[model samples]
Structure formats: C-alpha cells, structure tokens
Target: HMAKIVVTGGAALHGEVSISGAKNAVLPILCATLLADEPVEITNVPHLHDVVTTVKLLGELGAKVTIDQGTLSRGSAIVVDPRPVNQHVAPYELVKTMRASILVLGPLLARFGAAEVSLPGPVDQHIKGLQALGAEIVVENGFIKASAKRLKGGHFTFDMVSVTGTENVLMGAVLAEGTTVLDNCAMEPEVTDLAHCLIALGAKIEGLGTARLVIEGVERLSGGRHEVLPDRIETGTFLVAAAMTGGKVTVNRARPNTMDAVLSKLVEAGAKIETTDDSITLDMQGRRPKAVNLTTAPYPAFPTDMQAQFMALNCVADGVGVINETIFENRFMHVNELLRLGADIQVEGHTAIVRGSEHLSGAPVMATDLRASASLILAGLMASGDTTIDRIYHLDRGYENIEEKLSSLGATIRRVP
Candidate 1:
C-alpha cells in the first residue's frame, strides 16, 4: 500500500513547529544500549518508522524495550535492558528496509562474542576494522558473521569516512580490553551525541567532534539516562519550508550552534533569521529569496541531507544557483520530479544548476528517499495549483507528523492512502 500527501500550494506558513529528536543520533545510540548490562533510558525519542523498527530489532535480540509516551511539553522515552540479550543474530526481515541495522553488529560482537547480521554485502570497512581489533569476521550467505572470545583494542584507520562504520567500531572498542585508537572517523553531530551518551554510560572516550577517536575499554558498563539531541536536518527542513513559502515561522527545540552552515545560507538567501539557544525563527514574507550557491560536504559544512531541500528553495529564488553534491552518488533523483513541478533544474553528474522561476505549478510527484521526499513537499507548498506526493512512507521515517505540522502553519496539506 502507498499513501499520498496532497498540498494546495501558495500558503504562507505562519506558526511555530516543534522539532523532533535526531533520528541519526537516536538510532546508533539505541544500538549502543546493547553494551550496557543494566537498563538504559533514552528520552527525546521520536515515533518514526526507523525508530520503531530499531526497537523491534532490539526486542528480537532479547533486549527488553519499553516506550513511554511524551506529554505536551516533552518527547517520548524508551528504556532498553541488554542483560537479557542471549542471541546475536539480526535477521534480514528485520533490517531489510533500514541501513542503520548494521550498528548492532559492534555491540553484539563485543558483549556476546558473536554477531550474525543480515545485510546485502560489502561491509568491507566494517569487517576490516573489526578484524584489526582481533575479531574473526566472514561474510557468508548474505550475513556478516563475526566471533571472538574477547576483543583487544587495536589501531585502525577508515579508508573512507562512513558514519555508521565509525559508530560500529566505536561501540565495539568501548568494551574491549585495551585502548583503541581510530583515525579518519566521522565528525557528524550524531557521532558526538553517541560519544556523549557512551561517556554517560561510563565508557572512557575522548575526542568528541574530531576525526580521531580514543577509547579505553572498561571492565563493564552500567545503565544511564541520556536525552537525544534535536534533529538538525528537520530543523533545516522546516526553516526551508518557511523560507520557500515566504512565511514567518519559528522552529522550536533546535540547536542553532550546530546549524551555522544552514542558517547562514538561509540568511544569504534573503530570509530574516533569529536564533536562541533552543529555537530559530525565519521571516521571508513579501520577499523573494536571493539564490545562494552551495556545495555539500561533511560536518561544519553544508550537509548532503539538505541538498535537495535547498535546491527546492533555489527554484523560486531571484537568480540561478549551482549545487555540488560531494557526499553520495545518484542523489539527484529529485531533479526530475521537480522538473515535473515546473522547476528549472539541470543535473550534470553530481552538480545541479537551478534557474529561478517566479512560480512552480504543482503536479503529481514521486518521492525517492527520505530527504528527497522532504524536498518534494517543500516544493509542493510553494507551487501553484495542487501537488500530490506519492510514496510518503519515506517522509514518515524521518519527519514526525509532517502534514499536521504544515497544516498548523496554514498550509493546505493532508495524507491519503
């Protein structure tokens, strides 16, 4: 079954929307629960598809996971107890839709001395890094099988930067028998959040936001409570929605410090912006945005996840904008869908040249991935006539209650199956 989001464009969003917990931050942190012998309570958990899937995966591994609903002023809470986890297998059926499932490999192998996770293939970096840490790993029959009596901390440098790969090895090194030094690590905020959570769990980890990581294996880990950070991608998405629609809107519970790159771009694009410690407000009423060219890179730079949304913004801006995507390949799938909505965009390899148009007429569009789904919706809100977005399950995996939030901001949008 497929659901659709219908949006009648040309509405100026004019209210406040609360941001949810970071999906990237919470997924790896949830996997880190397996390293604890006691119950780890996580607050600020969002009710999302990938999150629900991760909770189910944890349960399948014999960890007791319980969810507590959030009140009007707070987000949801989940408590996971890893002591009862007696198995080390993650089945294909559980992880088929999400790539984050691989995060469990490190904790399971570190604590239980074994892990068999169902994944497609080419976890070469993960396998090589674990083998460097003294774990015997092999890939067979679509499963990554790893086992060791105990792992000793060793040195390994990632051939390339992989966020989940860095996280997987980080989790494994925390419970091993010596000091582990990792180089060429990912410096994303989610990685920092994981390090903060692990430190709260009594793991000796240094280098929070750098490319090098140092961790000393502790004898054991105890349970602790940690709150997940607010989602910066979601914050940027909402801010883009407000700017593209020429509206004045405020996003609550955001970390402005982590979004300097995004916020600065919005300011350069002619949006009046203000930020507090936990909130950001944008005012673009009665003004067309000036096109701001950007290139996507790693942390402290423009994020690849935001490339599509900002491209949507550039479609209705004052001039032409060039976007260079440096992180992932084939991320320009949304360029064609935006073309359907009458956006002037051209994709040459990884670069997209977008020429501004006074208006984009809405049409039926297909969503390709999580961030691409958001880009379509942002385009729809500012397009003329009606925009029907297909394959909205991708949107649900990231944003929390998107249509409702948009509706509250005066956009004419709804979900239908």
Candidate 2:
C-alpha cells in the first residue's frame, strides 16, 4: 500500500488559488548559486518536497543553506552561501530522486574546477555541450567525472532544443575565459529567468527569450536576490482545472505574458480568459468545453509537460481532439489509466484520438508520472463517483499542497496512506 488521494467528483471548483514558484526555475537557480562568491537569497521558492533534496545536496557540498518558511504571499525564501563549497561531489544517494541534480556539474566545474556527479542516465546533450566547452568528461560506473582548470569559451549549437542542456551550458559559459556563443538554445520562460538571474549576479549574457545566446565570461560572480518567475505549468494546470469543472478561478502571481499558447488553447476550448500583468482568470460557467487539437513542442508552442493534463481535458470536452506527442516517447502512459475512468481514447504511434463523452464514471486510477498525476486529479474532479489516485508522491514533486488548494476551490479530496 502507498499514499493515495481520494477525490469525489461533481464539484464546480471556484475561488483563487495562488500559483507557486516555478519548480524548474528554482532547481537550476539553486544549483547556479554555487557560482556565487557571497550569500544568494532567493524568494518565491515552492513548497515542494524535492526542494528538500536539493537543499541537502547543497549542504553536502559544504554550502550553508537556510530556509525560512511562513505565511508568505507566494512561498518560502532560501539563502545559500557557496563560499565553503570545496568538495565537488554530488552523490548518488541525493541524485537518484531528482535528475535535475545533474545541473550542479556545470557550476561545480566552473567554480571549483572539478565535479563528480552521478549519472542521470541520458544527458548526451549536456555531455556534448560541456565537451565542446573544454571540460574533460569521462563516464564510468554511473558517474560523470569532469574537470577543467579554467574553461575556455567556445561556440556550440544544440542538435535539438533542450531546456536543461541550454541551462547547463549557459552556467558553464558564465565563468569561462572568453566569449561563448550558443545556437539553437531553448527559449522557455524558465531559461530566460535563469539568464536574468545570472545577469543580476553580474554575468554578461545576451539574447534573452531567443534560440541563440552570446555570453562574455566574467571573472567572478557576486551574490544577489532574485524572485523566481511564477510557475507557468502550474498556471496552465489551474486554468485547465477550471475549464474541466466548468468553474471560475483566478490564478494569482501568474505570468500571463509567458502563457500565450496555453491561454489561447483554453480560449478555443470555450473558457473566458482574462489576464493582467501577473494574474489570469478563467470562467467556464458550466459550458461544455470544446475539443481543441494540439501538438507539443519546445516553447512558444504547446509544452510537452502540459500535454497529459490537456489529454484529460479533451477526455471530457464536446468533440474529438487529436493530441500529438513529439517530445518524449511513450508519454501516453496515463492514457490507459484514463481509460479506467471511462474515457474513450485511442492511441496510434505517438498520437491520441480522444472522443469526448457527456458522462464519466470515476474509478480506481494510478498515476504514471508527475503531470499524469495532476491529470488524474483533474479527471477525478469531474467523474461521477469517488476517484482514488495511487502513487501521489509524483504529484508532490511539482505541485505545492494541491489537495489544500483544490479543497479551497471546493473539491472534496483527502489523502490516505
């Protein structure tokens, strides 16, 4: 037996749930703090459990990590001083739970000259990019042993648009000897937030929110404060939830500017959307949502991370919706589980044909991945009976107090182990 969430359907969710800090943003920014010469204080950090593992990894590296939690408007604030981070080893015990732990390799190699991080299976893009930047890397027995005296600036272009690969290379380039120009970079808003944080720490980087980047290395970086950009994926999740329940909700602390593609798709799905500089309100008003076809891509397009959630949306909408998954193979792991909940979905190679139904009956469902867990919950909120979600540990990795937030929106949900 494992921890599970039991949700009862037929509740029209209403009210405002504040969006947490971007989990993708905080993970890399925490690793980037190792490059700082002083104390780096970061605000708007999420309350997710994976953050604890990150903090433990930082502490193991000899950095002083401190977190102050309160009833803050957004989330907690963390302070890290990396001046004492002499050891450059990121052990398997810490990295096995979170793959983002590999991000420390770039900062450790640049700031302390060497890094021994456990392999996160496949990071060919990260390996290739670091090799191009003059880092001698050798992989043996599930660990990456990398060393560089002082990295020399070099030019390299990614074979594919990779968000973490671009972030890893950008971190390595910020402290290199000369100019480093990178092509085919990821233009995700999280990456742009990282570049903004690096600049605040005094790194000379150009080409924010674009596919190409130019960086002139600085000698050292100083510590500073940066508020993480609001969670765009979380924003999209809540907006999808509102549309699924035919309810009205306002996601606070949301960056609507970074959510053009997602918000537009919701509009096509028959939700009335209103946005300000930092908030988005969705009004479905008991209307049957229209089916919208989508193809997932890197950025400024449909995001692969939000695909599963949208699949859940299409399962309950008005017409047929075709969803094509191009980012990861076999990401439709949640499709079978959704079928358990009475969804009519047929999968061909990398695409899904979903036929919406007026009535859906809730049943026992298991989560396959992180976003898949959220998708199950969204489906549960609309299904007829009680929906039990198994393996909700995946859900906690990204979302912060999801049950509390959903309950606040008037859904009946409870956790049991």
Candidate 3:
C-alpha cells in the first residue's frame, strides 16, 4: 500500500536532520555501469523511489545489483555483464511513467549501437535536452529510437540548462570516437559529482564545475567505488521548512558550495545560518521573514527545484515577494495548492507574485511533482490547522522517510496508510 502524509499545522521544526546523497547523480551513474563489465560500487546512495526504479531497470537489463547498509548511509554495488542488450526496446509504459528511463539511451547506444526507448511525453514542467545532442533521434507512435555507429560529439549547446539532458549526453559521449565539447551544460553539484565518478573510472573530462565541458573519449573504463555528493535540493527544502515554522534546524551533511544561491535568498529572508565543512545550521527565531525576489536560473543561481519551496516561505513574509520561474513554463503547478492554504499569489506566464499574509489556515492540497510535494508540506507545517496532501507518490520519488525526518525535528507530521 502507498503511504500518505498528514501534517498538524503550527508545529515548529527543531533539531537536526541529515541530507541524503544526491539522487540525481547516483541514478545516472548507476546506468553508466553499462560501460564496464566489472563490478562498480557506489557509496552514499540515497534510498528513494526513483533509485528503486532505476535499479529495477538495471535488473531488467541483466545486471546484478546489491545494496549494503553503511555506517552512515545505504550503498550499492552493481555488476554489469557488458553483454549486448537482448531487448533493444524499452516499452512505453515504463518510459512514460519515469522520464529517467530515457537515460538508458547512452548505455544502449554505446553497447548495442542502437536503442528504441519510449518517448517520454511532457510529464514535468521541464523540457528534454537530449534531442539537441546530435544523436539521431526520432519519435513516432510514442516511441523514441536513437541510432549512431559512433557518436562524434562536436560543439553541442543546450537551449536550456537541463540536468538530466546534460547527464544523458555526457554518458553517451564518454565512449564516443573523438573529443566532445558540451557548452551551456548544467553545472549542478550533482553533475560535477557524476563527472568525478566518471573520471575515477578513467574518463578524461575537463571543466567539471563550469557550463563548458570537454570530454576526451577513451576506449574502455574500469570499475571503481565513489561517494555521491550531498543532496543540495533536500537541504534547501529543510531550510524552507525551518523558516516557515520559525524553528531551529540543522542539515548535517549540507555542502555550502552547492547551495550558495539558496543560502543567499534564505539569509535575505531573515534566517540565521552557520556553515561548517559539510553541514549547515539554520534558525528562524520567530522573526518575520523579509520579502525577497527570486528567479530560478542555472548553477550559481537559485535552482528551479527550490522555487516552489521558496514560494511557500514567501506566503507569510513581511512584504510582497516575486518569483520568476525562468527554467520551466509549467512549474507553477504548486501555486494553486499553496493558494488553497490561504496564500495570496497571482501567476503570469512563468512569473508568480506572492503577497504575505498574517496567518494561514491549512487545507487539503494536491501535489503534482517531487519538489511541489515538499513545498506543500512546508506550508502545512506553518498553517493554523490540519493539512492533508494528496498524490504523495511524487514525494516518494525523491524524499526518503520525509514524514519521519520532520517528526524527528519535532514537527507534528505522520504518514497515513
């Protein structure tokens, strides 16, 4: 049975919660196992539904996977046989459900020389950037077929900075024939972590933390163990939760370098922050949050994933706040859910203007995406009454034991069967 979350509003979150490893980075890295036949061990893997989904896909492709609990977190070891995929086609049912299923394109093309994955329809607010990577791709009858004898990656630029798109092409190009140059690539910390792991596996890559990346192809790669980076998006979500409820909370494994943009915005909104080598502590001691304008951009800017949570915090700010979603057009799906919790917001195209209120009375809300679900829960923690969020499967895709994490921080939240 699926679990749903119930929040008793007006409960301040306190204490500390450790952020998980990067789900975005680990999944693609797991798929990259197709490059090597040997066993590759990945540490600091987060336990999330999407990870489970990727593991399931790996099993379907004849890879043996094992999960071991480490002293700090969960870890995984995957052994890829390097055999050509017997089934070159991925059915539409799985691909339409999880957009990440498209990630298999790189491994399939690299190993099998061709792949037929189901075309991932417009499920989320973001657009797929793999189409522009010079892979001969076609869509017909809800299926996508990508074929290339050997990818000779030239100058490829993204119209938009998409994390998964950058990753898909990079994985595909790692075994290509010649030098590959990727411009306007997403520079998220997780992407850099993936690049580091690839480098550990003998991939020649440059510009790990920049928009311009250069990859020199290699004939073969060997298996190695690498640690995934901390989840910066999760850290941002918890910071928003603490601020909305006027509580003290610490994200134990937060890396400040990956969250500079989010930290700047939170400080502007009156949250006290302290950072150590690998952790961040935040306190919101009943002070009214100062309104701040936010715009989601590429790396080193406010991330699009944190947009909805920041919008939820702005609902109760001292003054009017504006949020412009420059990344995706349909990302404001959570605005209606926020409005249900007594938030005052107006949407104009990709922009949202939020006006602060004295109090919010919790109401039933619906979650449409991963970050949207977390943002609604943050709003619920500050509202005056009970808030019930529906369609929480989206939360499972990213967060691990979200209700339990909130509960440990002294929030009155629970999962209902």
Candidate 4:
C-alpha cells in the first residue's frame, strides 16, 4: 500500500523534537565502510528509505550490514562488516533509487581495484576528480566503470563546490600512494563529519575546516566506530515549522554551529531564538516575520537545501522577499505546489519573488522532491483546510517518520494508507 500525509491546519506546534542524524553525512560514511577490512559501528543513524536502500546495497556487495531499527527516533546503530566486499558492481535498479549510490565509486575502486557503478547523479565533476587521482574510468551503457591499481594524487581544484564530489575524492585519496591537496573543496559540516569518520579509520587529513584540504595517503584503513552528526536540514525544518505556526518549539540535539546562516535568517524574520551548545528553541507567537532577501551559496552561506522551506516560511510572512537559487537547475519545482496553498510566488529563470500574505488556503498538493515535500507540509501547517500530500515517497527518503514527529509536537498531522 502507498501512503500520504494529511495535515489539518491551525495547530500550534509546542514541545520538543529530537533532530535525527545527518542523512547526507551518513550516506557517504556508509559507503566508507567498504574501506575497512573489519566491522565498523555507526551510531545515531537516521532510519530513512534511502538508508535502508544503502544497507541493502552494501549487503549486495558482500558486506554483512546489521542495523537495529527498534529505537527509531533517538537513533539506531549500524554495524557494517566489509570483510567480504568481493563484488564491486552497483546495480542499475538500486543506483537509480538514490543518487547518493554513486558514493561507492571511490571506495570500491580504491579498495577492490575495480567498480562498475551505475550513474546515480550528475557525476561529471566526480569523474574528473577520479581521473586526476589515477583511476581509469569509463562511462558507457549507463554505468561508470572505474579501476585503479594505485592512486597517486596531485593538486586538485574544483570549478565549483560539490559536497558529494568532494567527498568521493576524499574517500579515494585516503589510500592513495602520495599526498593530495584540494583547493576549493566543500567545507560543509557533513563533509567534516565524513572526514572525522575517515580519520577514525586511520586516515591522515589536514585542513579540517577550510577550503584547502590536504590528505596524506596511507596503506590501509582499519575498522572503527563513529557517531553521525545531527541533521542540520531537519533542524531548520522544525524551526521553520514553529515560526510558520507562530508557536513555540524546541529542537533537542540540534547543532547550531552548522546552521548559523539559517538561524541568523530566522532571527532576521523576527523569530525569537535561544541556543545552547546542542539545543535550539524558537518562539514566534504574536510575531510577524521580517522579510529578507537571500541567495543560496556553498558552506557558511545560506544552504540550498533550506531554500524551499524558507520560501514556505516567507509565504505567510509580513512582507515580500526574493530568493535566488544558485545551486541546482531545477530546485524551484515546489513553487507551484506552494502556490496551490495560496502562496504568491513568481519564478523567473533562477529567481523567485515571494510576496508574503497571511491568507494561506490548503489544497491537495504533490511532493516534488525531498525538500519540496517538507515545504508543502509546513504550508499545510499554516493552511486553512486539510492538506493531503501525495507522493511523499520523496519525503520518506530523507525524513524519518516526520508526520509522527510533528504529531508528537501537537500538530494535527497523520499518515494514511
């Protein structure tokens, strides 16, 4: 049976929601388990459809991935045994399920010496990075075939910042023969988390928090344990939820350091924010959001992942705002869905002009992608009527039982089969 989310509007979200582990960080770290010749334990893993797909993908490559999903919300532990990674082929069916499946290319080629991986996402930059690292990669028949006897790295620079692309090369270079210096690398917290995981496995990496990173190659990596960081995107989602509903909500286990850009923007919008080392509280009752314009950029700037959700927040704000999406070509797919809920958004080539209004009428909406699904749900929280979100399969790939989490926070949201 398929499922959809039904949300009745006008519920004030009050209470606490524990932010789950970083899905973006965990995906690459799961693939990194292939680098170890022994078992590796990863805690704080978010239970999502994409995560399950990743586990099955690892099992297909001859690894024994035992994960406990009983204590779903606070987090789960995944023990990955990669001693038997005898296979290096990623099936087309599984690769098509999640674009992050391409994460296997670097690890498989570095450890097993060969990999026939299906093209999961836009990996042109990843392919170039691999070639520079001495991997002979061929693209044909919808698959990426990469083989490397020994990776000898040199200086590598990017035309633009790519989180996954940077992560792919970093994994490959850990076992390379020499030093690899990367300029213009992505410094997102998720990338830093992956770096920490690699370091735990005996990798030597320098320039931990900067754009210029130097990775010194080693002979082998041993199995080790690491904890994934909190999901910054998910943290932003709940904070926006509180502000959109003009309610008070606190997110426990939230990492504010990784989300200063987003938090500052929320503060700009008149949402009272309180923060500690690991928690963030939002109080927006009786406050009107201050409209502000923003353009998406790489790390330390406004994140592209939070663009859609912010647009939803701006929908019911007190004034108009402009949003320029500089990352993906098709990120504005949620504009029409937001418009269905009575949002005033006009889209040009790469810009969206949002005129804030207080009158949002919910209608049945479609989920375009992961972030778009979150935006529609937030819109539903503010809409006047029932909002049924279809194709929430996109949402399931990222959020873990999000409707339940919101329902626990006093939101009138439910999942239906």
Candidate 5:
C-alpha cells in the first residue's frame, strides 16, 4: 500500500543539503513530555511519520498537543496534566508501527505505578535485550505488563548495543527512587543529547558521552524548551551522496563533533572533508573513493544506520568493501535489491562483502525498512537506467523531505503516488 519511488540513474548530485532534526533524539524526548507537569515545547522537530504517530499517542494519553506547520522552527508544544492513571496500556496496533512506542513504559510507570505495553518483537530475528535491565516485566500473549512501585536504580549490562533498549531503560531510570547505573549502554550523540535535555528538566544524570551512565531520581521535573541536535545520520547520508556522484556538497546545521566516526570513514574512503564549528562539507571531485571495511558499533563508532547507504557507495568503489553488522540481524535487506541493480554483494551470516563494479543498471526495487529505503535511493543515484523504488512509507518514518533534499543536490529522484 506504500507509494513507489522512481529514480533515473547515473545522475550526479551537486549543491548543498541542510540536515534536519535528529530522529534518534526527537522520539525519546517526546516520550519525556509525559514526565512534565506543564507543557514542554520542543523546537526543531522534523516532520516524520513517526513523530506524527507519537503525537497521536500522547493525545490518547490525555495530553493537549499541537503540531506547527511542520517546519519545527515554529515549535511543537505538548501540555501534560499531572493526573492519575487514565490509561496504562499501549496496544499493538499503535506500537507495532513505531517500535519507539515502548518508551512510554518508563513514564507510565513513574506516573501511574503500572504500565501494560505491547511486546515489540525482534526487529529481525535476534531477541530484544531490554528485559535484561531487571525491571519487573511480565509478557503475556502480545503485551508486556511492567509494575514498579518505586523503580530502584541498579547496574545493568546490555548484551548488544541496542539504541532503543538503551533509551527505554534510561527513560525508566530517570524517575527511579535511587541511583541507576547502566553499563555497555549505547553512546550515540542522540543519547547524550537526551541526557542533556533531561538535565535541563532537573533530572540528575552523569556520563552523557560515555558508555557508562548513572542517573539519580528526582521528586519532580518541570517543563522547559530545548533544541534537538542536527541529524548525524542525514549528514553522513548526504556525504555519501556527494562521494558517489563525484560532486561537492556542504551539509549545514550539522554537528562536527558528533560525526567523527562517520567522517573518518569518508576520509578513509578518499573523500575530502572540511569541518567548521557547526557544519561539514564534502568535496569528492577528482577523487577516487577506495573500498574500506566498516563494522557497526555503539557511539563514537561507525553507526549501524549509515551502513546500508555506505554499502551502496561501496558497490561502485574501485575494490572490495567489507561491512559487518553487529546491531540488527535483518539489516541486510537492501543487499538483494542492490544485487538486482548489478551490485556484487555476498552475504554471510552477519557480514556482507561487496565487490565494486564499473557501473550498475537501474532496476525496480522494494524498500523493507527505514534505512534500507535510503540505501535504494543511493544506488539509484549511480545506476545507468531508471530505477523505481517501492515502499517509501518506510522512508517517511525517519527522513524528512528526503526527495526534496536529494533534488536540491541535483538528483533525478521523486516520489510517485
């Protein structure tokens, strides 16, 4: 039922692209809105399907919400009343579409003393490790009931780097009775940004940019205005776009410190990068990008979200590029679609080895997930024939005005109804 995307290949993308608000930061922050007694206004909220869905969920929970003209600069505000438990359940119909809906478990428990949330299945096949945090969670049928009179902070270790799991547990611990220590937590910049925003709201937290976090519960938190950080994933995506097309592009409103890992990869792949205080520019003309090995890891490491689009770029590199996914199991959904476009990719368990070809011929493809859809568009940018991509609704969940952004960079891509 999703709309299909058609793109003409072998087109070079030039010009500048501005990054939008961070999807990773915005969702959890929206969940935190439940913790505030007064209305909290969040600026730089990107216009994404997931954001709209979250707003609807908040309204269902008795919060007065208003979405601006979708520019985020006008600001989106939520007025939350500190009322007793009205609805403690988040059903499957809502949580299934946006996995981040599970984030409500923390605030719901802190405010209502109980939470019945739908159990989110494995995004692929690997089990979600959120229960390892030692919360009193009972799973029945398709829902999870979590009860905590007063959440006590304890030491929890994550088996794998799960971003949502980290955010969920962190939100739960913010209102705990005592100190909560998390080990092996995801250190993504967005996680740090969330911590900073919580601090502004009077939550005592430590270890913002590190792998370990310690949070102390407070009696109450007040509403305040906070700015979301620029999207690093989008920044890296546009950087790859410039490299694949041998063009020069500047990404404004991007944070350079948060993009060190991805920027290092682009530089290693032979792309020229210039950094300012708040932006990054990629210059790839006359530069031949070499294939490099990339493994997804926690923050300060190569991001899992950027792996697919980077792989599309690797398909056209001069040599073999290796990508190892340590985050999600089914993240290689784009490999087959890329293969149909003449890409030489071999998948082995959690690893994908890509051999660069001279060029790729465009073909119709389907997008399975958020990042996968963006990867298909990246491949379409370099293909020889016209490429048609289906299921772009997945892309709408994350990227904001993606087609318009690519078009500004001189791409021959558009959305078709």
Candidate 6:
C-alpha cells in the first residue's frame, strides 16, 4: 500500500516556489554517463524519486554513482562512472517502471555492443533509426534486442517529435565511427541540453534547437560536467496553481524563453504575467479565470506534459475549454480524478471538454500518473474543504517534496506515510 496526501484547501498562496531542475532533462543525461570514460559530473539535478530510481539502475549496471544535495529547488549533483557492466539485459522488473529505460539501450549498445531490452509497446520509427545504424533489431517473447559493435551513423527523419527518441539517437551516434544527419527531431530545450551534455562529453553536434541535427561521432568521451535546465513544466504548473487559487506567485529561476507557449496561455486565462531574463512572476487575482482552448504539439507549441495541469485549471475557471492531446493516448487519466473534485468534463478520443463550475467540493481522489498527481493537487488547492489523494508514489516519482514547496507558498498540504 502506498501513502496518501491530505490537502486543506482555501489557502491563497502569495510567495515564491523555487523551481527545480528539469526531470526530463536529467533522466537521459544521467544515462549519458554510460558514454563517459571518466566520472560525469551533473549539477542542477532534481533530487526526486525518479532520479534516485535512475541512479540505482545505473549502479545495478556497474556505474559508480554519487549524489550531492543542493539547497535550492531540491537540487542536487550526480557523478556517474560507468565501466564493467554486470549484465546487458535491462530486465522487465525495472523497465516496467520507467519508459525512459529505452534511453540506456543506445548507450549500452554503442559502448557494450549488445543489449537485451524489455519494451512494453511500440516506438517503431524511433528504433528504426537505430537499426539503420548497423545494428540488429529483433523482438521475441518479451524482449527487444539490439547488437551494434560501435554504431555507424545514418541519416533519417523522426516519425514525430519524441524527446526520448531524439536523446536515444543522439546517444547512439556519439561514439559511432561517422556522421549522422537527423531530421524532424524533437527540439525541446531538454533535448538541446542533453546535446550540450554530449558535447561536453566530447561529442560534436550541430543544430541544437532546429529540426535538423548534425552529429560527428567521436571514438570515446571523457566525462565532463553539465547543469540540467529548470523544469518548464513545473514552472507552468506553479503559475497555473497560483491563478486558480486567486494568489500571487513569483517564480524564481524559471526559464522564460522556453516557456512562452505556456505563459502565453496563462496570460490569456486572465493572469498578470511579468518576466525578466530568467524568472517569471504570476499575479493571479482569482477574478474568475478565463477559459482557453489549446492543442498539444511538439516543442515551441503547447507541450503535452502540461496538458493535465491545464485541464485542472479549466475545471475551476469561468467557462469551458477544449484540450486536444496529440502526444500520448493514455494522458486522460486525470479526468476522473478531477471529477472527484466536482469538475464537469467529457472526453472523446484525444480531446477533453472541461466545463467550469461556480464552486468545487473537495473529495477523495486517486492519482494515475506523475502529472495527474500534480493536477489532483491543484484541484485540491482550488476546491473548498479538505482533499485526500491516494497513490502518491506517482507524485514522488516526479516532483521533489511538492507538498513542502506548496506549503511554503501558503498551501495547507501534507503527506502521510
């Protein structure tokens, strides 16, 4: 049995929530440690459960790992030294827990020459690019296998914008013998930061933020240092959280340039947003937030990661809003949890119809996923009376001490173990 969260709603938050480093950025970059000839020093890593899971996985694969906790944003530093891997198979027990386990496949194949992986479903186009790079691919019983004696780079366009797919390809190409030209790739800032990590590890890559990427392979990498980018998704969530509660919040260390689409939508929803070089302040007066419709797209568009939190925002707003999720089919898990808070919503295919109500009554809810957990928390904060959310392990996997962070901002929330 997992823990539960109890939230006492009706607190109008009025302080700053220090932004954590991007979980999406640090996951694969932590995987990048496999290519390091020496220990890779990664700073600005979020000290969350998912990263701890990643560090444990690395140690299981024979990487010497160390973590240094930082004071701001639950930040930390990780040092990964990879050598003499105990095994090449990423078993069902672990991969079943993290979809990003596919990230280690590229590095393990390129560095160790063989890898037996467990993949739950289809990621056809992403892996096809890897097979083109002189690697054998096969799927049997419950395994996706690949063998490459130092991958040879090849040119190909991605199926769609996949952040992990792009990272996997970039990792595979790093220690290869030649150059690769990638098209239609994911242009997320996290992916860009991962590319920088590769470059810091002595891999040469061009076109950091464009659809096309040029990678010139190197023989090996001397592990260097990198700082993970701030979590733009978290920033947007905090901004939305304050807005729904009629509160004022100033987010420090949030990257404004990478969050234009989200911040723009929040502004349209009646929040007063101001930005400086790297920070944003949201003044949510709680004067009936305006409803807005948005479609999730690849980078530079509304992110699919922020879809659920925004859905929660629409639930307590002045009118209805439509959200079309184009990224993942299984992202609507939060709809039912929001309904537990008296939110009215209808779902058809990949879209959700969220009708705003005059008041919401807090009730017991269960979290379905990482973002879903955040959505539930937002709803609990907005609704009257207390709310209890179960399956909080999902929440631990992403946000770092979110209850503590929100409490600092005047939210009455606590976790019961």
Model 3 has how many clashing residue pairs?
0
Error of 6 at 105 (Å): 2.2
TM-score of each prediction: 0.93, 0.93, 0.85, 0.91, 0.85, 0.89
lDDT of 6 by residue, 302-363 (tens): 99888888888898888899999988777698888888889999998889999987678889
Candidate 3 residues lying further than 4 Å off, grouped into runs, are 1-4, 69-96, 122-162, 346-350, 392-394, 397-401
What is candidate 5's lDDT per residue for 1-417, written digit by digit as tens? 678788887766778767667988989888887786666778777777788888888777777777664431222433344343267787567788887888787777676677877866532111232243345677778777777666777778777766777777787777777788888777788888888878888889998888898989787778887778888887888889888777788888778999898999998888889999877888887665688789998677898889998898898887999999988767688888898899999988889999987679998888868666888888888889788888745456323546668887888887788
Clash count for each candidate, listed in order shown:
0, 0, 0, 0, 0, 0
Candidate 3 lDDT over 141-206, as tens digits, reads 766777776666566777767787788788877877788888888888888988898889888999
Error of 1 at 356 (Å): 1.7
Alpha-carbon deviation at 72 in model 6, angstroms: 6.4
Name every residue pair that clashes in candidate 5.
none
Q: What is the lDDT of candidate 3?
A: 0.76
User: What digit string (tens of lDDT, one per residue) describes model 2 on residues 294-347?
Assistant: 999878889888898899899999999999998877679998899999999999
TM-score of 4: 0.91
Estimate every model's Cα lDDT from 0 to 1. 0.88, 0.88, 0.76, 0.87, 0.77, 0.84
Candidate 2 to truth, TM? 0.93
After superposing candidate 4 on the true structure, give the runs of residues whose Cα lies further than 4 Å from its correct spot: 70-72, 139-143, 392-394, 397-399
Candidate 2: how many backbone clashes?
Answer: 0
Candidate 6: residue 88 Cα off by (Å): 4.6
Give one digit per residue, the lDDT tens place, for model 1 in 1-417.
458889999978899988768888999999999999899999988777788899999998999999996643356899998889988999788888788899999999999999999875347788888988999998888789999999999999999988888999999999999999999999999898999999999999998899999999997889999999988987898888889888998998888888999999999899999999899999996687888899998789999888988999999888999999978776788888999999999888888999989779999998857656888888898889999988745456423656667787899998887
Candidate 4 local Cα displacement, residue 42, angstroms: 1.2
The better candidate by TM-score, 1 or 6, is 1
- Candidate 6 residue 68 Cα shift, in angstroms, is 2.0
The local lDDT score (0 to 100) that residue 386 gets in candidate 1 is 94
Mark the 10 consecutive residues where model 2 has the least summed lDDT. Answer: 392-401
